[PDB]
Design a protein around this ligand. Sequence first.
Ligand SMILES: COc1ccc2ccccc2c1/C=N/NC(=O)c1ccc(O)c(O)c1
Ligand SMILES: OC[C@H]1O[C@@](CO)(O[C@H]2O[C@H](CO)[C@@H](O)[C@H](O)[C@H]2O)[C@@H](O)[C@@H]1O
Ligand SMILES: OC[C@H]1O[C@@](CO)(O[C@H]2O[C@H](CO)[C@@H](O)[C@H](O)[C@H]2O)[C@@H](O)[C@@H]1O
Ligand SMILES: OC[C@H]1O[C@H](O)[C@H](O)[C@@H](O)[C@@H]1O
Ligand SMILES: OC[C@H]1O[C@H](O)[C@H](O)[C@@H](O)[C@@H]1O
Ligand SMILES: OC[C@H]1O[C@H](O)[C@H](O)[C@@H](O)[C@@H]1O
Ligand SMILES: [Mg+2]
Lengths: 420, 552
Amino acid sequence: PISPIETVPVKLKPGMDGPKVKQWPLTEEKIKALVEICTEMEKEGKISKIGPENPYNTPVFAIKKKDSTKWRKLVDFRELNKRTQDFWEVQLGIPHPAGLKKKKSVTVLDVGDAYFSVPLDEDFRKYTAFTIPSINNETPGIRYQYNVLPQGWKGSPAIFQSSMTKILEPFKKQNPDIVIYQYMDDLYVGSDLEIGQHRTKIEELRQHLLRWGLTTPDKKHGYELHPDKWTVQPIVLPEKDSWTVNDIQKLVGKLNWASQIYPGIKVRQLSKLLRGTKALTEVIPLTEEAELELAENREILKEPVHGVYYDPSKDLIAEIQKQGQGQWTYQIYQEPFKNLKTGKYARMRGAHTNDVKQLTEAVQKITTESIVIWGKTPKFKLPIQKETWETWWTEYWQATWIPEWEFVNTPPLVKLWYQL
Amino acid sequence: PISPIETVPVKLKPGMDGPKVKQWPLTEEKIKALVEICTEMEKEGKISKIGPENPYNTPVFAIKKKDSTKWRKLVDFRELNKRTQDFWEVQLGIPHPAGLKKKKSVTVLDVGDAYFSVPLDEDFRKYTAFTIPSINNETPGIRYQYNVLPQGWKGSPAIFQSSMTKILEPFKKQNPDIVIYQYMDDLYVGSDLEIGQHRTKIEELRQHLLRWGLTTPDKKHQKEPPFLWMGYELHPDKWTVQPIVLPEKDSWTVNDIQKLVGKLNWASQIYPGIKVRQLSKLLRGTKALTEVIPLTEEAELELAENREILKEPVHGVYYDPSKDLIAEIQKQGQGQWTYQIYQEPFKNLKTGKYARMRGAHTNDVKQLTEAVQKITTESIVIWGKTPKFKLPIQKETWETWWTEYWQATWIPEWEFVNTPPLVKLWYQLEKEPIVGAETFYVDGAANRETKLGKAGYVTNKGRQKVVPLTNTTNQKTELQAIYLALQDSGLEVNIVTDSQYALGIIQAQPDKSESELVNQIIEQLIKKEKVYLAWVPAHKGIGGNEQVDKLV
Ligand SMILES: COc1ccc2ccccc2c1/C=N/NC(=O)c1ccc(O)c(O)c1
Ligand SMILES: OC[C@H]1O[C@@](CO)(O[C@H]2O[C@H](CO)[C@@H](O)[C@H](O)[C@H]2O)[C@@H](O)[C@@H]1O
Ligand SMILES: OC[C@H]1O[C@@](CO)(O[C@H]2O[C@H](CO)[C@@H](O)[C@H](O)[C@H]2O)[C@@H](O)[C@@H]1O
Ligand SMILES: OC[C@H]1O[C@H](O)[C@H](O)[C@@H](O)[C@@H]1O
Ligand SMILES: OC[C@H]1O[C@H](O)[C@H](O)[C@@H](O)[C@@H]1O
Ligand SMILES: OC[C@H]1O[C@H](O)[C@H](O)[C@@H](O)[C@@H]1O
Ligand SMILES: [Mg+2]
């Protein structure tokens, strides 16, 4: 009937129970797709229907690949994760190569399918249960639980880690300068070849993987990334010629908030021109003892933070601020005012690009950056409405994972971050 | 009776055992009804006398109804549930009527001893164990155990609804033309066919149901057109709120208002424009349950109107799939917006209200945004898709606000609706200073203790004023200054504040506040032609701010 079924038995550590998360209400569109998908998986054996004797449930969504033709199921295993973590991060964890962020090109390719060939630990399948919603609560939702390593679960990879690296065993010896970090379903290939060749070694691997185990990756004659290029650090102060009282004030404050990070930021002889109750539209030519601070400080602001070191026990925070015009800035950090990275996202080739869409991309962007630089996904403090977000993101969202997010209503630094 | 369904494997939380509670040997006017009943169930299989074993017991009280034949044995499993494993929590939601697709002539079914017709886990039966005392006060008690769902054992609405479904599953397939809705022991088989042929089907599901152990009533199939449902009144081509009792008293309490307002919230679904802001503004004196709460002059005026609204019955329509959904809003002020989702003129599926989020500083556009939202999230439930919006604002007014709002908003797809009031931002701040306009350097502090402050200013032209304040907060003197500058200043002005707060509140362009102070400021903004507000860090040597920063 069946062969030697050896599955890695999984456990949640003592004190935590399977996930019990409410299934979100989806558009009749997404349901129907989610309906066919499982209908087929159930048929494939990948999943099975369950009863009321499984109190467990994780949210499941539906999103387009890039193929606004066909949908793909995206289960939000954010909870089942934290409750298995001691397993996918302790026991069978996957080390993160610090060089990956150095190579000139990193192509990220999907390996999620290599997972539906590995049976899930009997006594654990019960925690991977999900419900396919019903319009207007008409009928009761549909109940399924997995039978194979499900994508999205941070264990699917940790379990596959062996079969995987074993497949990479011939390719890695032969191409010993290429980095290959497996983060969940995604596989990151990093190297330093021509942007032409780098698309060939990939293909080699692509082909290698395709044969060896039919670990079918979804390529598309396939996601180029350039780690090195990411180096956006200055915080330019407008350095004009004509300054009004008003512009000096805007500068001091914008210069004072500043010092909350950089230690040697000295705003004194600047308050020198701000002396006297003057009109705001009054040009005051910069003094002689004055522009010291202009550039003497612009310097401490030319060379970045000294004493900012990542911590693996504390998690990562990512803040994004709408900057206007498809302009979105952001900072990654841990101890308020001690950034690990800062940058900008941009709307460039889309006349249908709206806030939400941007944010959803600006986020996935920031998430991959971390996944690369740190091997871990940050927690976002999204400047959007909790209700609106929880409705639309799965629209333009098209990643295989979901980070932690919360919602904020920003203290208007005049975003002492923008340059223009 | 005894359904040939397969059973749902049940257990108890890890490390627990059956409840071994005992029977307060009670009567015989009842240690009789029990033996009569049990034995009658025992025949029907619902139960089976259990051996001289280890089984734990459960209390089996009895009570009597008021129509007359006899008593009800009511076992109290409270201690069995506590030990019973959790279950996939059934539909916690209720299928709102405005979204059941219209049909020609619907039916309804009332499953019988539902719970008692579904077999119980052949292994979790031993924990249902109980006993009724002897007919005499002596004690050779009678032992039984359940073979079907217990009547309120924890897992019952679950394992029932479960099994139900897996039965209707095969029926619905051989009949892809009938939408049977399920809720408790209620089936909503309905379709649009000659009325005669249709019955041939209902009298068919019924055969199939009874075929497998589930029983259903029958005038032939029992209910006429006016159906009741969790508070609804579903006609064959219309739905409506069941009747509402909006009382008149000479005394109300914190318990009398939740009832009122609670009754008022429900009626809004279809009753257009049920204002209930001031009435709920009351439930927060303190949360004592019984309290002589004096009606307010505003509530009694609000309730008087709510009554006049209810003094006239309104209907609700059914959902038509091919036709789409349209939703339109309208602001009643005070942050009270009302809407209505429809497909056709004079035919709403439902209307509702959108309260003000009970906050402190929000402008119409914000609210209208959150309004659209509430309606969006909701339309995706009752219907499954979002509606075309008809919002009382012009694409021009919106475009402005979002492209200038630090937050990422997303009003989806609307059309203009010219019917006042029309949502609009009343005052606007100069993005840059104003040259030939006096610059007021304001600031005003207060003693956190003595609760005494003074707001004031000092300008370029050399004018100064300090107005003494009393029983004020610090933020009060902070805004007291901006308001003071707006007073003393001319037609266009530039203000410099050390107040993060003051600024933000105004730079929020939040119209419609309660706080007299804000509205005065907001009012004074309106009157001004051009205003530019500036923020500088206080206590930082501004040879121009370290003035009022020291004068106050
Ligand atoms: C327990 O229920 C009642 C007791 C007494 C009544 C007296 C007069 C009218 C309706 C009544 C009702 C309710 N009758 N309700 C139904 O037969 C019904 C059928 C299909 C559905 O989908 C649904 O949601 C409710
Ligand atoms: O979108 C937030 C919302 O998502 C829920 C599921 O309905 O939970 C998930 O997302 C959270 C985001 O911070 C995670 O922290 C949580 O672990 C995950 O299951 C809700 O709980 C939450 O309100
Ligand atoms: O059909 C839109 C049109 O209907 C109007 C006036 O005829 O209002 C009536 O019809 C609406 C249809 O949805 C009802 O909601 C409304 O209560 C009723 O008075 C206008 O709203 C609009 O121009
Ligand atoms: O135009 C769409 C693409 O724009 C940018 O590259 C985004 O970072 C990426 O997430 C998105 O796929
Ligand atoms: O909800 C009350 C329930 O009482 C009992 O369990 C009955 O068997 C069932 O008909 C009903 O569903
Ligand atoms: O919202 C309050 C109302 O909810 C439902 O209609 C209940 O059946 C009714 O008892 C209650 O008055
Ligand atoms: Mg001050």
